[PDB]
């Protein structure tokens, strides 16, 4: 898949985008790759931080669905008018499909100054599509209309410019080394997975493993940080603080709200521990671990005021909606979203993050005799229970 290698670009902390074309004649836009949502939505009216947008009036193939959609986030919102148009990925498979498109007509805190993407490609499953699951997501239309295999893979390589690859329909062996380990997709909504054990510099956090997946764990290219449920995040911060106790940092650093700096080239990486997340294996009683270096979770931020200094932001943060394996985790790894086989694969990425003495790793198997169920069952609302799925 040499045509798809290197088809991602981005800015540090503003995700990764792929080129897509919409309409006829083709209007090219840069579209955020988001495995944490399931709408394809594109800016479709002027905005101060956009200089291009989808012009439905210029597409002879555009059809209006005459139905609006409103998508709130805890940080902002976008809203728009649903329709369909022809869509292709110029640096992807050689096919064109008729897909649902939400034309974003207004938004708040969604498009950011200097980001360079004009829309978002929700790669997760219909269940979480807005306004409901009857709006077929892009990848579903892609696989149904063409012979593209039902799989995609992401190599996300670490404002600074970033790059990577989204291989659509395949796995490209040139983008990883060593073993590829698969963990099951627990349920097809988010790319939900189960973490069975967490270690910080080889020391077990020794929490009940349900705490790791409370109320879910998901793989999310739309999230920057590794985000951890409250109790886990506190135990992790306690452990990382212990390891790094030669350095007393301010509270704001541990909150993600303050940089910490050393003289250029002197950062003491050795005092910051590796973190290993052990993911359920395909075989009952087996897991494998993914091991993250501090260079993945301490993100450099170029200081405008101290040229002499290497400065970093702590990129692990607290969650109340479960564990989120964001860019912090993914940047280590070639991640295969094997929708056909309901599994997610992890191998060490060919764009490796370097530490002098340690390596981001994917290792297994680890066997447990004790097969505790580490999944959490989210309390069923009457709202969920009552909707019919015909
Ligand atoms: C998918 C996308 C665009 C959805 C989104 C919507 C809105 Cl309105 C505001 C921010 C985000 C958002 N935030 C990401 C960072 C992002 C911005 C732009 C592109 C990709 C990622 C995020 N990551 C975190 O770690 C975090 C925390 N803690 C909070 N937020 N990601
Ligand atoms: Zn507004
Ligand atoms: Zn531009
Ligand atoms: Zn019914
Ligand atoms: Zn349904």
Residue 137's alpha-carbon distances to 13, 98, 125, 261, in angstroms, are 25, 11, 7, 43
Taking alpha carbons only, the member of 357, 359, 373, 331 closest to residue 10 is 331
Domain 149-390 top-level CATH class: mainly beta
Query: 163 Cβ partners below 8 Å, 6+ apart?
Result: 6, 8, 9, 10, 157
- The Cα–Cα gap between 123 and 133 comes to 14
Tokens of 379: 């309390």
Contact status, residue 288 vs residue 367, Cβ threshold 8 Å:
no
What number does the ligand 1 atom closest to the CA of 37 have? 1
- The Cα–Cα gap between 372 and 287 comes to 12
CB atoms within 10 A of CB 12: 17
Phi, psi of 383 (to 5 degrees): -50, -50
- State how beta strands 27-34 and 119-122 pair: parallel
Compute, in degrees rounded to 10, the torsion defined by CA atoms 264, 269, 270, 273.
160
- The Cα–Cα gap between 222 and 119 comes to 12
Whether the link from the prior residue into 222 is cis, omega within 30° of 0, is no
Contact status, residue 63 vs residue 154, Cβ threshold 8 Å:
no
What number does the ligand 1 atom closest to the CA of 222 have? 1
Contact status, residue 85 vs residue 29, Cβ threshold 8 Å:
no
Residue with tokens 């940047």: 331
- The Cα–Cα gap between 328 and 221 comes to 9
Contact status, residue 20 vs residue 82, Cβ threshold 8 Å:
no
CB atoms within 10 A of CB 268: 11
Residue 105, SS3 per DSSP: strand
Assess whether the C-beta atom of 7 lies below 6 angstroms from ligand 1: no
Residue 127, SS3 per DSSP: helix
What number does the ligand 1 atom closest to the CA of 315 have? 25
- Point out which residues pair with 104 in neighbouring strands: 43, 80
- The Cα–Cα gap between 20 and 285 comes to 42
Tokens of 13: 């902390």
Contact status, residue 221 vs residue 154, Cβ threshold 8 Å:
yes
The CA-based diameter of the chain, rounded to the nearest angstrom, is: 64
132 catalytically annotated: no
Taking alpha carbons only, the member of 215, 238, 239, 210 closest to residue 323 is 215
- State how beta strands 217-219 and 323-325 pair: parallel
**What DSSP line would sit under 283-319, residue for residue?**
STTEEEEEEE-HHHHEEE---SS-TTEEEEEE-EEEE
Domain 16-148: which CATH number of 3.30.420.40, 3.40.50.300, 2.40.70.10, 3.40.50.720: 2.40.70.10
Residue 335, SS3 per DSSP: strand
For ligand 1, mutation pick of 9, 11, 15, 77 (most atoms within 8 Å of CB): 15
Residue 14's alpha-carbon distances to 32, 77, 104, in angstroms, are 9, 16, 19
Ligand 1 centroid distance, CA of 222 (Å): 6
Catalytic residue among 133, 172, 215, 220: 220
Residues in the chain: 390
Assess whether the C-beta atom of 76 lies below 6 angstroms from ligand 1: yes
Which structural technique was applied? X-ray
Contact status, residue 292 vs residue 275, Cβ threshold 8 Å:
yes
CA angle 155, 337, 221 (to 5 degrees): 55
Resolution value in angstroms: 1.8
Contact status, residue 170 vs residue 336, Cβ threshold 8 Å:
no
Tokens of 309: 């200094």
Residue 204's alpha-carbon distances to 115, 275, 293, in angstroms, are 38, 10, 17
Tokens of 221: 């290219």
Phi, psi of 143 (to 5 degrees): -75, -40
Residue 58, SS3 per DSSP: helix
Neighbours of ion ligand 2 (CB under 5 A): 106, 108
Residues of the chain within CATH 2.40.70.10 domain(s) are 16-148, 149-390
**Burial grade of 185 (CB within 10 A; 0-12, 13-18, 19 or more):** buried
Tokens of 325: 């394996």
């Amino acid at each position: 898949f040499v045509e798809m290698v290197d088809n991602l670009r981005g800015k540090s902390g503003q995700g990764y985008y792929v080129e897509m074309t919409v309409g006829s004649p083709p209007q090219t836009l840069n579209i955020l790759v988001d495995t944490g949502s399931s709408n394809f939505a594109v800016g479709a009216a002027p905005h101060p931080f956009l200089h291009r947008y989808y012009q439905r009036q210029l597409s002879s193939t555009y059809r209006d669905l005459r139905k609006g959609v409103y998508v709130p986030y805890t940080q902002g919102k976008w809203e728009g008018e649903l329709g369909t148009d022809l869509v292709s990925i110029p640096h992807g498979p050689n096919v064109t499909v008729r897909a649902n498109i939400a034309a974003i007509t207004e938004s708040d805190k969604f498009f950011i100054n200097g980001s360079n993407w004009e829309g978002i490609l929700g790669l997760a499953y219909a269940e979480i599509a807005r306004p409901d699951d009857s709006l077929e997501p892009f990848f579903d239309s892609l696989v149904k209309q063409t012979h593209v295999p039902n799989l995609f893979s992401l190599q996300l390589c670490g404002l600074a410019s970033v790059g990577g690859s989204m291989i659509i329909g395949g796995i490209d062996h040139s983008l990883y080394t060593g073993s590829l380990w698969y963990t099951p997709i627990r349920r097809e909504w988010y790319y939900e997975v189960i973490i069975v054990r967490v270690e910080i510099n080889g020391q077990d956090l020794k929490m009940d493993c349900k705490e790791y997946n409370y109320d879910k764990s998901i793989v999310d290219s739309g999230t920057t940080n590794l985000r951890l449920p409250k109790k886990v995040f506190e135990a992790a911060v306690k452990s990382i603080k212990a390891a790094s106790s030669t350095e007393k940092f301010p509270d704001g650093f541990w909150l993600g709200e303050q940089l910490v700096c050393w003289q250029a080239g002197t950062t003491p990486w050795n005092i910051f521990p590796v973190i290993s997340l052990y993911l359920m294996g395909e075989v009952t009683n087996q897991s494998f671990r993914i091991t993250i270096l501090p260079q993945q979770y301490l993100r450099p931020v170029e200081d405008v005021a101290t040229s002499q200094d290497d400065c970093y932001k702590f990129a692990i943060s607290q969650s109340s909606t479960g564990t989120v394996m964001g860019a912090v985790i993914m940047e280590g790894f070639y991640v295969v979203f094997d929708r056909a086989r309901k599994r997610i694969g992890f191998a060490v990425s060919a764009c490796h993050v370097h530490d002098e003495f340690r390596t981001a790793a994917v290792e297994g198997p680890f066997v447990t005799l004790d097969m505790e169920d580490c999944g959490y069952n989210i309390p069923q609302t009457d709202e969920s229970r009552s909707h019919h799925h015909h």
